[PDB]
Amino acid sequence: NQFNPLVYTHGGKLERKSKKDKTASKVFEEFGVMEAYNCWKEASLCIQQRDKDSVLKLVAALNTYKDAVEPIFDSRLNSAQEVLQPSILEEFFEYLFSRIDSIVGVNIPIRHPAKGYLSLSFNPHNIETLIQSPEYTVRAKDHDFIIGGSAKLTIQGHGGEGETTNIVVPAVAIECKRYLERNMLDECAGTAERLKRATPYCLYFVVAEYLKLDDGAPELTEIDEIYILRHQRNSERNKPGFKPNPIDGELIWDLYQEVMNHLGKIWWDPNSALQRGKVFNR
Amino acid sequence: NQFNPLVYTHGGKLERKSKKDKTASKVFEEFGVMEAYNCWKEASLCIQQRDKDSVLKLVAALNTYKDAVEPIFDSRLNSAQEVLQPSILEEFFEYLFSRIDSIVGVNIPIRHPAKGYLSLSFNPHNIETLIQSPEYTVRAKDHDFIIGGSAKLTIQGHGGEGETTNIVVPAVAIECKRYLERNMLDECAGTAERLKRATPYCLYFVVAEYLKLDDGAPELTEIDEIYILRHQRNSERNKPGFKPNPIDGELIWDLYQEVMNHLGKIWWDPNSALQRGKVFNR
C-alpha cells in the first residue's frame, strides 16, 4: 500500500539533452545544473506531509531551483528554451501530487504529462473493412500534467479480431506556461471545450508565471481556473532593475486544495443534488 | 451468398398499431390498408434488377401505395400521423437497397433505421471507478435509414473486466421527411456536423416530399444532398384543386446511383489522390 508513481519529467529532459546535445551537456556540468537539480529533487522528496506549511516549503524549494537554473537556460542555451524550462513546473506537480494515494484510497497510475482522450471516430478503408474491422482514430491532447486513469479501448467488427488502443482518462489536467499570451489562451479555450465534452468531470487549470495580455478580452469558457504565480506582467521582465516576484506559495496551496477536494468527491451524485437543491456546491 | 436483410419497418409499425391501437385496427381492416401494404411489398420484392427502368418501377409501386393509404392515415387516424406515414419511405429504402450484397461483395448487416454512433465520453462515478472501470456514455443519433456496419466497443480499466456497447457505424444515412421546414433542417444541419466528425466517410442525405420554407436562408453545411421528391411546396397541399405531383423516379434513380458509387469506393486513397491531383473527384 504505497505509490512510487514519480517520473521526474524534467530530470529526464536534462538527461536527454545532455546526451542529445553535448554543448548543453558542457554547460550543464560547467554551471552545476545537475547538482542544483539533484538538490531540488532531494529537498522535495524530503517534504512528505501536505499541510499548508509543507506545501509552502515545497514551493520555496521550487523557487530556489528556478532561481538557480533558469538564468543558465536563458543566457547560455538559446536553442534549449521550451526544451528544458517548461518541464520544471511539470515535475513540480509530480512532487506535489506524489502522496495522494493513501488520501484518495486508490493507486492513481497517471501523474505526469500525457495525452488525454478527446474523441473516437471511424475512418474505414472501404465497405468490406467497415463491416469486418472498421479502422478508427482516437484523438487526444497533450497536457503538461494529468492526474487520471488508463484504459484500453477495443473495437471489433464482424471479423471478430479486436484492435485495441490505450488511452488516458484525466480527472485533472494542468497546462504549465512561463507566460500566458493570446494565441495560447485561445488554444486552451478550444481545448477546454473538447475536454469537457470527452470528460465532463475533469478539472482543467491553466498555470502561468507571468501574464502577457493586452486590452483584448479573453474567453475563459470551461477553464476551471487560471493562475499567475508571480502576480507579474511579462513586459516587466525586460526592464532595467526588474526582479521576479517568487512563485506565490499561497496560490499553489489553493490549487492543491482544489485538486484534492475534486479527487475526493463523487462527481455526479443525484441524491446529494436532491438533498442540496443544487447540482453544484461550493 | 445472398442477403435477406429486409426488416419491413412500415409493415412492423402497421402490426404494432393494429395491436397497440384497436381503433386503428378497425380502420385498417375497413379501408383495406393491410392488403394495400401486402400488395406494395409483393410488387417491390418482384422487381429484382436495379437498372433505371427497374428503379422507376419500384417508385411507381411506392406512389401507388402512398396514393392508397396516405388519405386513410390523414383523414381517419389523426393520432397516427407521424406514427405510420414516415415509415413508408424508410421501408421503401429497405427495398431499394435490398440487393446491394452481390454488387458491393459483402453482407451489409444494417439497412434500416438505426442509431448511428456519434461520440464516446467518460463520466466516471468516482476516482476509484475511474481507475478500475470508468463509466462511459456512447452518444448516437436515430436516423430514418442507415446502410452500415455494426461493431462492439469495449472499455477496460485496471479491474480488467470489460464493458461492451454495440454500435452502428454508418456508410450512408438518410433522413425521410414528408415536408422540410426550418426547425427540422436546422436540426439536420447540426446532426450532419456531429456525424461527419464521428464518421467522415458517411454520406448524409435529407429526403423530403414537399418543401415548406419561407424567405429564410438555410445552412446546408455538410449535408451531402437534399431531395424534394414531388417538386412541390407544402403550402400547395391545402388549396382547392391541389393534386400532389408523384414522387419523381428520376430523383430516386439519382440517389440510388450516388449511394452505390459511394459504397463501391475506397474513401481515402492516397495514391489515387496523388495521381488525380485532387483528393475529391466527381
Side-chain angles (χ1 to χ4, degrees):
Chain A
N1 277 21
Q2 201 66 309
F3 15 88
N4 228 92
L6 261 147
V7 322
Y8 291 136
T9 299
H10 175 71
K13 282 167 183 327
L14 291 176
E15 254 309 317
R16 213 170 82 202
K17 198 65 196 333
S18 184
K19 296 336 140 182
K20 179 101 174 261
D21 182 347
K22 272 254 300 192
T23 305
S25 153
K26 258 217 166 202
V27 159
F28 292 158
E29 291 139 72
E30 295 161 339
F31 292 90
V33 170
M34 301 313 207
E35 154 183 48
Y37 166 74
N38 175 97
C39 177
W40 178 45
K41 172 179 173 168
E42 286 194 4
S44 299
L45 282 187
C46 256
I47 297 160
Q48 300 185 355
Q49 305 303 314
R50 282 302 181 276
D51 59 298
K52 172 169 171 165
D53 270 284
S54 296
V55 164
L56 297 179
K57 274 177 202 172
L58 275 165
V59 167
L62 168 68
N63 274 307
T64 292
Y65 181 61
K66 286 169 161 291
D67 296 343
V69 301
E70 292 191 338
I72 296 145
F73 299 157
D74 294 337
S75 66
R76 324 212 161 243
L77 286 173
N78 258 37
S79 293
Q81 213 353 75
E82 184 127 11
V83 153
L84 292 173
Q85 189 276 344
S87 48
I88 303 176
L89 270 191
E90 299 177 355
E91 191 158 328
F92 173 73
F93 294 117
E94 289 161 357
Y95 296 133
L96 183 64
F97 295 113
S98 57
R99 308 202 150 257
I100 60 183
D101 280 3
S102 41
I103 288 107
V104 151
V106 66
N107 274 119
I108 291 177
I110 305 288
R111 269 176 288 184
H112 55 74
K115 294 205 185 103
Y117 169 80
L118 287 182
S119 69
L120 167 66
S121 57
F122 294 90
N123 41 72
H125 174 80
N126 60 33
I127 185 65
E128 203 265 359
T129 77
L130 173 51
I131 300 340
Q132 290 295 106
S133 46
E135 292 88 352
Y136 65 91
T137 302
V138 170
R139 250 135 212 136
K141 193 74 180 88
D142 282 338
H143 301 281
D144 297 327
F145 186 77
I146 287 184
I147 301 166
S150 69
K152 293 173 179 308
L153 187 162
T154 308
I155 291 298
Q156 296 171 279
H158 193 266
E161 217 168 271
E163 296 302 316
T164 299
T165 308
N166 292 312
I167 60 173
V168 170
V169 183
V172 171
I174 302 183
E175 309 306 0
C176 304
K177 300 284 167 268
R178 194 190 204 183
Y179 50 92
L180 203 51
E181 18 179 22
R182 181 177 181 170
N183 201 54
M184 178 77 231
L185 189 28
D186 295 338
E187 281 202 338
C188 292
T191 299
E193 281 181 332
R194 306 177 61 205
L195 168 58
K196 298 293 179 156
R197 288 198 307 261
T199 51
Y201 307 147
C202 183
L203 205 56
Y204 186 59
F205 289 152
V206 171
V207 169
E209 301 181 28
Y210 300 92
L211 176 71
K212 168 190 197 168
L213 295 167
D214 49 327
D215 296 4
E219 194 182 344
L220 316 184
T221 64
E222 269 152 310
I223 301 162
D224 296 312
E225 183 67 278
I226 304 157
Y227 291 91
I228 318 290
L229 293 179
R230 297 179 187 268
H231 306 260
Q232 281 176 319
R233 206 182 295 276
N234 184 75
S235 71
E236 282 176 68
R237 293 168 51 185
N238 67 22
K239 316 211 116 47
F242 164 83
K243 179 62 173 171
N245 287 336
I247 287 163
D248 184 353
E250 304 292 321
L251 301 170
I252 299 296
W253 176 237
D254 290 1
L255 185 159
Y256 173 84
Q257 278 177 287
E258 247 165 344
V259 165
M260 296 306 81
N261 288 349
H262 173 73
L263 293 176
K265 263 170 155 82
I266 298 163
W267 299 301
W268 166 245
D269 189 350
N271 299 304
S272 197
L274 274 153
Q275 172 206 78
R276 281 182 309 242
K278 41 217 232 261
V279 171
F280 303 97
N281 231 18
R282 283 43 93 118
Chain B
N1 277 21
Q2 201 66 309
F3 15 88
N4 228 92
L6 261 147
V7 322
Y8 291 136
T9 299
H10 175 71
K13 282 167 183 327
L14 291 176
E15 254 309 317
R16 213 170 82 202
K17 198 65 196 333
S18 184
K19 296 336 140 182
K20 179 101 174 261
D21 182 347
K22 272 254 300 192
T23 305
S25 153
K26 258 217 166 202
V27 159
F28 292 158
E29 291 139 72
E30 295 161 339
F31 292 90
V33 170
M34 301 313 207
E35 154 183 48
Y37 166 74
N38 175 97
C39 177
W40 178 45
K41 172 179 173 168
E42 286 194 4
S44 299
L45 282 187
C46 256
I47 297 160
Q48 300 185 355
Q49 305 303 314
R50 282 302 181 276
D51 59 298
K52 172 169 171 165
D53 270 284
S54 296
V55 164
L56 297 179
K57 274 177 202 172
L58 275 165
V59 167
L62 168 68
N63 274 307
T64 292
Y65 181 61
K66 286 169 161 291
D67 296 343
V69 301
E70 292 191 338
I72 296 145
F73 299 157
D74 294 337
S75 66
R76 324 212 161 243
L77 286 173
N78 258 37
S79 293
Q81 213 353 75
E82 184 127 11
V83 153
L84 292 173
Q85 189 276 344
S87 48
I88 303 176
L89 270 191
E90 299 177 355
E91 191 158 328
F92 173 73
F93 294 117
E94 289 161 357
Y95 296 133
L96 183 64
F97 295 113
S98 57
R99 308 202 150 257
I100 60 183
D101 280 3
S102 41
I103 288 107
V104 151
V106 66
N107 274 119
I108 291 177
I110 305 288
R111 269 176 288 184
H112 55 74
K115 294 205 185 103
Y117 169 80
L118 287 182
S119 69
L120 167 66
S121 57
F122 294 90
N123 41 72
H125 174 80
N126 60 33
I127 185 65
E128 203 265 359
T129 77
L130 173 51
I131 300 340
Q132 290 295 106
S133 46
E135 292 88 352
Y136 65 91
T137 302
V138 170
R139 250 135 212 136
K141 193 74 180 88
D142 282 338
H143 301 281
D144 297 327
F145 186 77
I146 287 184
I147 301 166
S150 69
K152 293 173 179 308
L153 187 162
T154 308
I155 291 298
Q156 296 171 279
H158 193 266
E161 217 168 271
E163 296 302 316
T164 299
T165 308
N166 292 312
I167 60 173
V168 170
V169 183
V172 171
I174 302 183
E175 309 306 0
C176 304
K177 300 284 167 268
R178 194 190 204 183
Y179 50 92
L180 203 51
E181 18 179 22
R182 181 177 181 170
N183 201 54
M184 178 77 231
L185 189 28
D186 295 338
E187 281 202 338
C188 292
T191 299
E193 281 181 332
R194 306 177 61 205
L195 168 58
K196 298 293 179 156
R197 288 198 307 261
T199 51
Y201 307 147
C202 183
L203 205 56
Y204 186 59
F205 289 152
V206 171
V207 169
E209 301 181 28
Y210 300 92
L211 176 71
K212 168 190 197 168
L213 295 167
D214 49 327
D215 296 4
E219 194 182 344
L220 316 184
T221 64
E222 269 152 310
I223 301 162
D224 296 312
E225 183 67 278
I226 304 157
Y227 291 91
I228 318 290
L229 293 179
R230 297 179 187 268
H231 306 260
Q232 281 176 319
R233 206 182 295 276
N234 184 75
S235 71
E236 282 176 68
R237 293 168 51 185
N238 67 22
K239 316 211 116 47
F242 164 83
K243 179 62 173 171
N245 287 336
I247 287 163
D248 184 353
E250 304 292 321
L251 301 170
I252 299 296
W253 176 237
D254 290 1
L255 185 159
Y256 173 84
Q257 278 177 287
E258 247 165 344
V259 165
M260 296 306 81
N261 288 349
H262 173 73
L263 293 176
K265 263 170 155 82
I266 298 163
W267 299 301
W268 166 245
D269 189 350
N271 299 304
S272 197
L274 274 153
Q275 172 206 78
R276 281 182 309 242
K278 41 217 232 261
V279 171
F280 303 97
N281 231 18
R282 283 43 93 118

